[PDB]
């Protein structure tokens, strides 16, 4: 396989202590996707550290991080600071017949910092640092020139800058593409994944939103909003919760049928274990009025029922069924719940 260079996967088979170009050495393995790898590597002539992702010695994969490259540098491009919440590569090239992508090395992912909580979650306080520089982000990717759909939101997707500061970057666009062709595709991680591709309608940049607002609920409590087996339970968990989507979304949905009934008067149902619809209430999850999740906030700073009322209702208008009036990266930011 490739000169001896790859194994039976097509990925690079990676040597700690290896030097590429007299200019790179691979420290280690950091990072495995469907994509290859990601290595941290020695950069000796800008003397500092960088992320390497090797894409598989692979076509399909190859003209997909092709893609990845074209957004990476569109969004490089841009004049504004907004740019700095996504990850930075400094450049790419071929290397032992592999696509290299070179980026800044970042820190721990948000999974981690979950694990380190014991998956039982981070302040409010926290979370609202997230959510601003996540809605920025956001803010950036719908600029028209851009309109980029990152399509795999997740906690293992955005990383702390350095293990000290609450800044924050997206990466693994891998996934992503421009808005264009509304089609429908079986995308994002399941948890994270909106009720619009559950249902087999096509997607636009307000699933990034959905997959957002599951992110920062998971981030205070320490757990997924709607963990599902699969895609009947993932429907039934976020149903559990938001009620039954509106009958004008169900009677375009290709796929109304896999979760729901249509009865004789027009009216939709889950189709035939689980909570009943609406009845596991954001209120409770979160704690509103019980000090926070589990009651673990009860008497802290910025854990007020107020603070908890405004963090509800902005989670409430990421998690609208309806794709058109969800909320708006802008509308996001103006939120009470960032009025400090
Ligand atoms: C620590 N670190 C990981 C990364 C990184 C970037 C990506 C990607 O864009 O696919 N995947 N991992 C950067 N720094």
Redesign the pocket.
């Given at each position: 396989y490739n000169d001896g260079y790859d194994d039976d996967n097509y990925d690079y088979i990676v040597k700690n202590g290896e030097k590429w170009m007299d200019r790179y050495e691979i420290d280690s393995l950091?990072?495995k996707?469907s994509?290859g790898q990601?290595v941290?590597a020695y950069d000796r002539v800008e003397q500092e550290w960088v992320?390497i992702?090797i894409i598989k010695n692979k076509k399909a994969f190859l003209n997909q991080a092709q893609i990845?490259v074209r957004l990476?540098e569109l969004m490089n491009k841009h004049d504004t600071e907004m740019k700095y919440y996504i990850?930075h590569?400094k450049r790419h090239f071929m290397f032992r017949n592999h696509l290299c992508?070179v980026?800044?090395?970042?820190?721990?992912?948000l999974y981690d910092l979950l694990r380190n909580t014991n998956f039982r979650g981070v302040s409010l306080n926290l979370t609202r640092k997230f959510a601003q520089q996540m809605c920025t982000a956001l803010l950036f990717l719908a600029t028209p020139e851009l309109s980029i759909i990152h399509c795999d939101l997740k906690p293992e997707?955005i990383?702390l800058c350095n293990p000290k500061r609450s800044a924050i970057?997206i990466?693994?666009?891998?996934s992503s593409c421009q808005l264009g062709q509304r089609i429908y595709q079986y995308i994002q991680s399941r948890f994270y994944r909106s009720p619009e591709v559950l249902l087999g309608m096509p997607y636009d940049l307000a699933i990034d939103m959905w997959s957002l607002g599951c992110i920062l609920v998971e981030m205070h409590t320490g757990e997924p909003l709607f963990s599902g087996a699969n895609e009947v339970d993932q429907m039934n968990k976020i149903v559990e919760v938001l009620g039954i989507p509106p009958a004008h979304i169900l009677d375009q949905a290709p796929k109304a049928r896999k979760f729901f009934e249509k009865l004789p008067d027009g009216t939709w149902n889950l189709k035939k274990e689980y909570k009943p619809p609406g009845t596991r209430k954001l209120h409770n999850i979160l704690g509103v009025e019980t000090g926070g999740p589990g009651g673990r906030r009860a008497g802290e700073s910025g854990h007020t029922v107020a603070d908890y009322l405004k963090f509800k209702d902005l989670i409430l208008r990421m998690l609208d069924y309806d794709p058109k009036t969800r909320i708006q990266p802008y509308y996001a930011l103006q939120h009470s719940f960032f009025k400090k």
């Open positions: 950091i990072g996707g994509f990601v941290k992320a992702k990845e990476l990850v590569l992508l980026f800044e090395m970042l820190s721990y992912n997707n990383l970057k990466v693994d666009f891998g």
